[PDB]
Amino acid sequence: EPATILLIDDHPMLRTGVKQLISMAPDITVVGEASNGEQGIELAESLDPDLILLDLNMPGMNGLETLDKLREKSLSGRIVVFSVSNHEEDVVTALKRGADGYLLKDMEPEDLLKALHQAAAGEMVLSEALTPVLAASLQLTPRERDILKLIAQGLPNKMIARRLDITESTVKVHVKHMLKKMKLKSRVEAAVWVHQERIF
């Protein structure tokens, strides 16, 4: 029952530390690791983790390429990236490319832990500061409309499941289907869209 996390990076000491941090929280767990983008895309697709942690600082300068390719697959979880830096343009680019959030490698262990846990097993809404960025870039089953409404509120898969009295597996199936259906690449984008048009 703990939330699953897929780690994609090629930065040993960072992964070593992140693993230690994840051990401090029983309700979250690492389901897979990958030091190669291609391998990571394979694991992402077959495991469909609640959280995919991607490092954009990977060798070959193809971190943003792996993101495009992940966003091509049918995923129902969240993708949080380790930004190159805290510069506005490095951040907005990641979000525009399909990431739900971003983290910095120089965060304090205590704060990083809270961020990973929130992204994997908690509520997570985009800050108003970054909302216009996604807004700039921007046939539904009754059950899917219910799921979309809750997604707009930032609820994770598990909370949505225990709310609509459905199994988490069917939630994931519904999320990836209506997402790929409505031409939406991420959950934050789905949330921003809904609020933009005030569907609810």
Kindly list the residues in this chain that would bind Pt ion in the complex (CB under 5 A). 24, 159
Nearest to 77 by CA among 43, 37, 105: 43
Residue number of the CB atom closest to Pt ion: 24
Could you tell me the smallest distance in angstroms from the CB atom of residue 112 to Pt ion? 10
Other CB atoms closer than 10 Å to residue 67's CB: what's the count? 24
Q: Which is nearer to Pt ion, 146 or 168 (CB)?
A: 168
Q: Which is nearer to Pt ion, 3 or 67 (CB)?
A: 3
Could you tell me the smallest distance in angstroms from the CB atom of residue 67 to Pt ion? 26
Which DSSP string do the residues of 16-42 spell out, in sequence order?
HHHHHHHHT-TTEEEEEEESSHHHHHH
Using alpha carbons, list the distances in angstroms from residue 13 to 16, 108, 148: 5, 15, 38
Could you tell me the smallest distance in angstroms from the CB atom of residue 119 to Pt ion? 12
Q: Which is nearer to Pt ion, 113 or 134 (CB)?
A: 113
Structural Rg of the chain based on CA atoms: 16
Q: Which is nearer to Pt ion, 112 or 130 (CB)?
A: 112
Could you tell me the smallest distance in angstroms from the CB atom of residue 116 to Pt ion? 11
